[PDB]
Design an enzyme around this catalytic site. Structure first.
Site, PDB file in Angstrom:
ATOM      1  N   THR A   1       0.807  -1.227   0.000  1.00 17.70           N
ATOM      2  CA  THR A   1       0.000   0.000   0.000  1.00 17.70           C
ATOM      3  C   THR A   1       0.835   1.269   0.000  1.00 17.70           C
ATOM      4  OG1 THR A   1      -0.413   0.338   2.375  1.00 17.70           O
ATOM      5  CG2 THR A   1      -1.835  -1.237   1.210  1.00 17.70           C
TER       6      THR A   1
ATOM      7  N   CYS B   1      -4.159   4.788  -4.770  1.00 16.39           N
ATOM      8  CA  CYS B   1      -4.580   3.501  -4.244  1.00 16.39           C
ATOM      9  C   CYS B   1      -5.625   2.932  -5.185  1.00 16.39           C
ATOM     10  CB  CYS B   1      -5.113   3.617  -2.804  1.00 16.39           C
ATOM     11  SG  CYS B   1      -6.418   4.861  -2.548  1.00 16.39           S
TER      12      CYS B   1
HETATM   13 CA   LIG Z   1      -3.071   6.709  -1.437  1.00 18.35          CA
END
Ligand SMILES: [Ca+2]
Ligand SMILES: [Ca+2]
Ligand SMILES: [Ca+2]
Ligand SMILES: [Ca+2]
Lengths: 230, 230, 230, 230
Positions: free
Chosen positions: D83, D197
């Protein structure tokens, strides 16, 4: 990659394994999302059965030869016949269409040779066990001695294929009969045994022999993928 | 019977059920050892995915069209594309080869219309649920109103197919989600629900719906067999 | 909570549900923002498959033992092998790393015994149904009577898993076969049935059985979470 | 093949996509049955959170660094942090374990520069959009100018990720907000847009942008697989 011409539908149930395995082999070798380029001519089995019932192998040869030519027109570069027995007309098919034909006996011979074996047992239909197209080819072309069961046992092996396995009947007593025939072949000093009929593998497997077993259908499929990628 | 031309390999795993179901239908109808007359052109999926990934529908259509023309040369009389999304260029393939093409959406629309249904729910990948080639065809060509889940639920449905079902993963929370989405479609008054891909039936089936369910793949294969035998 | 050492990648697709379910169990039990403490060693399946195909269990054991030792170095306090058949060398892996190993067959045996069952049916690959590491372990170590299908049905069950389910191929005739085998087991008096691998769920489930089904994979994940929390 | 050391995202749901994608990439590139060699350390987020609440951020950072050192002990050859937001401590992790760290920003930067782009717009959590760890790296290390949304738009973008997208909720008004923010970045003359993301792709995608879009998380997993194979 070469375009494979498959002649199948004899039966369609025994054709699926070819389609599956050739594709699995191509994907394994090439990766990505690659699958095989296959043109499959799947005939109506009933037409072939009616011909065999009249002993008309000439017309059967013509039917499959015509399928091969149709596959050539479609772009196939080699012919793969998806049945051991129908190699009885493989020479006719090859002569008729002019494409290379990847013969099931030659593909098996490759694996037999790779294991250093010069004496093998052979199970299949009576045609496959007795005639020049498969048994005669292992010997005359590849120098492999072939041992088959005796006549009473060939009759049983053959009957079980046509009478039971082909109709999806898988019998424990028939399994025991094949197990006994296998022991007799091994008693003759064979170094492996060929299961020369897709349906035989429904009944017995590697655990039923003390020598290497050769599943001709699986070996043929692998050989076809190898050829496509060569 | 007519010779069916199947275009498959997209993927090969999903072509097997077509080949199996079509042969089973022919055997059930004609009996004996009858099998379908099928000429299958199985493409290299890697090539198709690459074109689709680039949005190059023109080349993709050309490739499938060349496959259809190959099958025509081999004797096929009708074309069946054994995949859903490539139907985006079905009309082009049909025009290119000059054979009738049995469109997956048309086969399902016929069943729906015959049953008096005019408002249908559609489940499948996001592409199937949103794009013109399937849902648009049901509406524009067949006059059927198509209801899909809301945005949140379409995302869930699609994620589950790609990240789980395609990987052989069956989650009980995912099964519950599909059950809920079905109930939501029914609450919107749909009179039937289409399962756009076979993966859906890994989680839910007719027992989960109060309205009739239409397995578009199964209907497609049955329509192919029916056409061959008519 | 204990740190769980998972050995996976056999295949990676099968590892995902272990990782998901263990985390879900921990979150359910501890609430809040809790997840499992997992260290996962995912191997290259190709290496394992090649060893398995050559029957080189010693090297396969060494590979997985090294994975377990690696996890011990990283802080794992227990080993969970996320596959069934490699449990053939579980005792060697456990000895090699000096951590307890939560054996898939023990986890399921525990659930079976807690439910007061002493006669169970077992479906899975031929490895699982026929060898000592799973079947023999239930009986010998846990006193549970294990009924498996007959020779014929085992061959079919196994063929279907390898040739169809592993590929996502869902055949209705195969579904029918599993349903019959389930009824035959029940006829035998089994008080429950184990599904040895997740592939079986692709075809059949709890609806198909009149007795409780034991999903050995789900049970394994649950046992791993419980052990970590103990 | 290099052994990859993966440090899990705070949510295991965020880690599974890395495991899936890396494995899919390796299988695609190598063929066979190949899967990635990965050692994944998945922490209990509760432990991190509790330390942070206590104001002990140093120990919390030590915990992730500890995970990386443990991965080194287990034989990992490079660290991949799952992430984008997690990269807030990437510098700390790299300094702590001494292993190379494959930074999400570097993997994306080289793809951007290959396309001749030197000015991009960045969407992500507020952390990702405002802090040094991601954008600072693009500009300072790679010479790529970074435009971000204004404060009100960053608040909205961030809220939607945390309150909706992480829960799979797709709101039409949120989608419209993201579409507007994209046009605002385009108005600032960006030559490309980064989706910080993958959650963002639930609302918007290439179809919403008149410049190339970069899914930095997907690019990260692709780069990890590629590096393992070098
Ligand atoms: Ca992000
Ligand atoms: Ca679909
Ligand atoms: Ca209407
Ligand atoms: Ca129905």
């Amino acid at each position: 990659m070469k375009i494979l011409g498959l002649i199948g539908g004899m039966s369609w149930e025994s054709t699926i394994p070819y389609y599956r395995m050739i594709n699995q082999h191509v994907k394994a070798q090439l990766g990505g999302l690659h699958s095989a380029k296959i043109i499959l001519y799947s005939v109506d089995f009933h037409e072939i059965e009616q011909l065999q019932a009249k002993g008309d192998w000439q017309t059967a040869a013509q039917l499959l030869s015509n399928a091969a030519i149709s596959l050539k027109h479609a772009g196939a570069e080699v012919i793969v016949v998806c049945t051991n027995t129908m190699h009885k007309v493989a020479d006719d098919i090859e002569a008729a269409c002019g494409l290379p034909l990847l013969h099931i006996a030659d593909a098996t011979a490759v694996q037999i040779k790779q294991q250093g074996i010069d004496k093998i047992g052979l199970l299949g239909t009576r045609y496959t066990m007795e005639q020049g197209f498969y048994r005669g080819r292992l010997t005359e072309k590849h120098g492999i001695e072939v041992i088959t069961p005796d006549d009473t046992d060939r009759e049983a092996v053959n009957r079980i294929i046509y009478e039971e396995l082909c109709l999806g009947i898988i019998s424990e007593t028939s399994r025991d009969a094949y197990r006994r025939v296998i022991k007799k072949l091994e008693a003759q000093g064979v170094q492996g045994i060929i299961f020369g009929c897709t349906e035989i593998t429904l009944l017995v497997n590697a655990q039923d022999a003390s020598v290497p077993v050769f599943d001709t259908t699986a070996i043929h499929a692998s050989a076809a993928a190898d050829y496509a990628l060569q």
